[PDB]
C-alpha cells in the first residue's frame, strides 16, 4: 500500500532518491532514503541545563 501511495504521488517505489551536496554540488552515490518524519522537541532544553 505504501508503494501504491508513492506511485500515485509521482514518487519512486523504493522510497529512495538522489541527493546533491550543497557545498560541492556533486551527487551522493548510493541513493539516500528521504521522507517525512514526526519529530518531538523534548523538555530537556540546554538553556535549563547549562
Amino acid at each position: 500500500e505504501i508503494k501504491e501511495l508513492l506511485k500515485l504521488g509521482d514518487l519512486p517505489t523504493s522510497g529512495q532518491i538522489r541527493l546533491y551536496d550543497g557545498r560541492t554540488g556533486e551527487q551522493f552515490e548510493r541513493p539516500v532514503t528521504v521522507g517525512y518524519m514526526y519529530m518531538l522537541k523534548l523538555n530537556h532544553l540546554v538553556d535549563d541545563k547549562m
Binding site: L19, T33, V34, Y36, Y38, K41, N43
Partner: protein, 249 residues
C-alpha cells in the same frame, strides 16, 4: 498535525481538557481570540432560559512545567457546529488531533560526523521558521516580610544602583507591564533594613573624601534569573491587611 498518525490523536486531544468542545450544537454567533458565542439550535435548548453557549478561552497561562497553555479558535464566523466538534484547539492540538511535534523532511545519511553517535543535523531553515520555537512562562515573586530591623520595603529607591536599572520601574518600584527585560534587570525593587554598618578605616576615608554616605538598608530585589530573557505579561500584587495600598496596587 502529524503527517503519519494512528487515528488515536482525536481520542486524546478531545478527551484531554486542553481542547474546547461544544456542549450543545448550533451556529457560531461570535468568534474571538478570547471567547466564542454559539447560538444553540431550537431543538437542543432548554425551555425556560436562554439562549446561547458562551465559552471563555484560556490565554497564555503558566503551566506546571513552566510551559505555555493556550487555546486558539479553529472556527470562523457563522459556521454550523454540532455537539462533539472542537471549538478551539488547545496546546499541541490541530483541529482536534493531538500534535506533539512537527513534520520534518528527514534524509538518512552521514554528514561530516555531525551526526556521529546520535547527534542530529538540523537545517537552518527549521530554526528560521520558528516551527520548533517554544514559549515558556516563569513565575517569580518578591516577598516583603517583617524583620528584626523592621518591615522591608518595595520602594524603588535602592542604593548601589544606576539610573539605567531603575528606569524600568514605577513609582512603587515594580516592573512595567509589557516591558521586556533580561537577566540582571530588577523586576520588583525591595530593600531589607540592615544596620550596625562598620567600615575599615580605608572606607571611612572614602566616606570623608567624596561625601558618599553609607545607607542603612540592604538590597533584596526580584531580578531576572541569569540566562533567561523574556517579556512581562502579568504582574500581581498581594497586600496584607492593615498595610496601606501603594500606587501600583
Amino acid at each position: 498535525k502529524p503527517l503519519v498518525g494512528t487515528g488515536m490523536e482525536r481520542a486524546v486531544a478531545v478527551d484531554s481538557g486542553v481542547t474546547a468542545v461544544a456542549k450543545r450544537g448550533g451556529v457560531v454567533q461570535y468568534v474571538d481570540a478570547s471567547r466564542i458565542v454559539i447560538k444553540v439550535n431550537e431543538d437542543e435548548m432548554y425551555p425556560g432560559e436562554a439562549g446561547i453557549d458562551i465559552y471563555n478561552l484560556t490565554k497564555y497561562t503558566r503551566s506546571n512545567q513552566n510551559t505555555c497553555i493556550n487555546q486558539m479558535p479553529c472556527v470562523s464566523l457563522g459556521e454550523p457546529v454540532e455537539r462533539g466538534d472542537v471549538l478551539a484547539d488547545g496546546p499541541s492540538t490541530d483541529l482536534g488531533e493531538l500534535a506533539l511535534g512537527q513534520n520534518m523532511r528527514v534524509a538518512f545519511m552521514p554528514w561530516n560526523g555531525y551526526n556521529f553517535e546520535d547527534s542530529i543535523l538540523v537545517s537552518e531553515r527549521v530554526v528560521q521558521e520558528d516551527r520548533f520555537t517554544t514559549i515558556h512562562i516563569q513565575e517569580l515573586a518578591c516577598v516583603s516580610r517583617d524583620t528584626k530591623l523592621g518591615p522591608e520595603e518595595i520602594t524603588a529607591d535602592i542604593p548601589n544602583v544606576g539610573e539605567a536599572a531603575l528606569s524600568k520601574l514605577d513609582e512603587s518600584g515594580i516592573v512595567y507591564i509589557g516591558a521586556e527585560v533580561t537577566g540582571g534587570d530588577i523586576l520588583v525593587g525591595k530593600v531589607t533594613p540592615k544596620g550596625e554598618t562598620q567600615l575599615t578605616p580605608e572606607e571611612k576615608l572614602l566616606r570623608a573624601i567624596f561625601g558618599e554616605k553609607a545607607s542603612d538598608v540592604k538590597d533584596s530585589s526580584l531580578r531576572v534569573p541569569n540566562g533567561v530573557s523574556g517579556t512581562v505579561i502579568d504582574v500581581q500584587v498581594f497586600t496584607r491587611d492593615g498595610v496601606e495600598k501603594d500606587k501600583r496596587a
